[PDB]
Amino acid sequence: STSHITILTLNINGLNSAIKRHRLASWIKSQDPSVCCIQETHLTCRDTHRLKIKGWRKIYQANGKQKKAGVAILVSDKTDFKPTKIKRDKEGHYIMVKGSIQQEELTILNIYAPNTGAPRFIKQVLSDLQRDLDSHTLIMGDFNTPLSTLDRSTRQKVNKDTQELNSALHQADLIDIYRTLHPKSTEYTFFSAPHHTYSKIDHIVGSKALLSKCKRTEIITNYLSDHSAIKLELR
Ligand SMILES: [Mn+2]
């Protein structure tokens, strides 16, 4: 009674510890997503083979040379994903996987933007990947930036760089899917102790044409990381 895919995004804050990988493996099994986007694996390109998660053996990774950044898209053993293209960031800040599930195209960009210059860094990735964006695109991960005023407890208006980022997303027919489903949401995914500020810096952005297929979306607090996850249910 179940042909809905669920895609999940989570900044995990490092996966070099095997015991930590087992906690993530159990958590993923509980959440039972079809597709899983992880940020900050902290796995070097040498160590990517260490990432094993029972039940999610299709794993696509982009990593740098230090124990820094690192992203991964995991696909459930129960989901038939046929890939056509995988594009990896050399520094491990993003990976794009294109393919299909059950004859329907899906383009997933998993992104981990740097703390500094985040909206400009994302705008540049969009430009670099311009030819690969389409109307079946999901962009999810740790943008390290609000996209609109309610993504921060301070309710500060977004900066010019963020505004230029949103214009570029608009040119690609991409929307903030979470806030379109929950326009007055005041939920958060990260807490900054130096300023006692709460912010939603993790995002699910996607093609306008996918909106009708998005059933549910919600945030998931956890004991694994300094970020809460976000889950999307798709038709
Ligand atoms: Mn971290």
Author numbering: 4 to 238
Wording from the paper:
To aid our docking efforts, we solved two EN structures by x-ray crystallography. Previous structures of the wild-type EN at the time this work was completed did not contain bound catalytic metal ions. Since the EN requires either Mg2+ or Mn2+ for activity, we believe this provides a better representation of the electrostatic environment of the active site for docking than the apo structure (protein without a metal ion). Our previous attempts to screen compound libraries unbiased by AD2 used the apo EN structure and resulted in no compounds with in vitro efficacy. Second, we expanded the structural diversity of the compounds screened by using the structure of EN bound to Mn2+ instead of the apo structure, and were able to find additional inhibitors using LeDock and AutoDock Vina by screening ZINC subsets, including FDA and internationally approved drugs. Therefore, we used the structure of the EN bound to Mn2+ for docking of Groups 2, 3, and 4. For example, the structurally analogous site to the EN S202 is the APE1 W280, which decreases the size of the APE1 binding surface relative to the EN. In our molecular docking experiments, we included the full EN DNA binding site (area used for docking is shown in Supplementary Fig. 1a) to maximize potential interactions with candidate compounds and opportunities for specificity relative to APE1.
